[PDB]
Amino acid sequence: DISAKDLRNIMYDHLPGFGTAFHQLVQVICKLGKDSNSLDIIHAEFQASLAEGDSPQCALIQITKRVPIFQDAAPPVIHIRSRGDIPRACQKSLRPVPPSPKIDRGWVCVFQLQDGKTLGLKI
Ligand SMILES: O=C(O)c1cccc(N2C(=O)C(O)=C(C(=O)c3ccc(Cl)s3)[C@@H]2c2cc(Cl)c3c(c2)OCO3)c1
Numbered sequence: 654d655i656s657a658k659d660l661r662n663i664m665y666d667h668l669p670g671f672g673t674a675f676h677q678l679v680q681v682i683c684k685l686g687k688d689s690n691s692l693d694i695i696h697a698e699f700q701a702s703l704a705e706g707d708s709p710q711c712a713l714i715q716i717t718k719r720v721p722i723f724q725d726a727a728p729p730v731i732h733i734r735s736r737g738d739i740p741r742a743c744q745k746s747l748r749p750v751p752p753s754p755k756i757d758r759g760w761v762c763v764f765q766l767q768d769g770k771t772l773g774l775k776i
Pocket residue numbers: 657677680681683684685687729730731732733738739740762
């Protein structure tokens with residue numbers, strides 16, 4: 654069966670740039686997908702969206718809206734040392750964390766920094 658790493662690579666193969674907010678959204682989709690044994694339906698939705706003519710970016714957002722593990726779900730917390738550990742291409746997408754961030758509203762993840770700071774990654 655397809656693994657989280659396989660699916661990450663497949664999705665990466667469709668994205669422009671490196672270390673962008675969409676690359677992180679791929680990471681989150683694969684990790685949450687792995688943890689809920691849903692990598693197959695996620696891959697199926699991804700390919701179906703591309704097949705309909707959607708951009709790969711739109712296909713990733715549609716996964717957050719169509720695959721039920723993401724619906725009304727909070728973004729995962731990812732512990733990191735400092736803001737510098739986040740890829741350069743994501744930096745301008747980092748925001749203060751709103752009261753009830755939701756993945757299907759574009760809040761990809763929340764970075765929990767060592768010194769207590771928290772930053773949400775927004776699309
Ligand atoms: O361990 C796994 O099975 C697995 C599956 C998919 C993705 C990942 N993740 C990584 O290996 C990894 O480095 C991940 C990552 O996105 C980042 C780490 C540091 C910065 Cl900055 S971003 C990623 C991962 C994604 C999510 Cl949603 C996580 C996570 C790691 O830990 C808790 O929530 C792990």
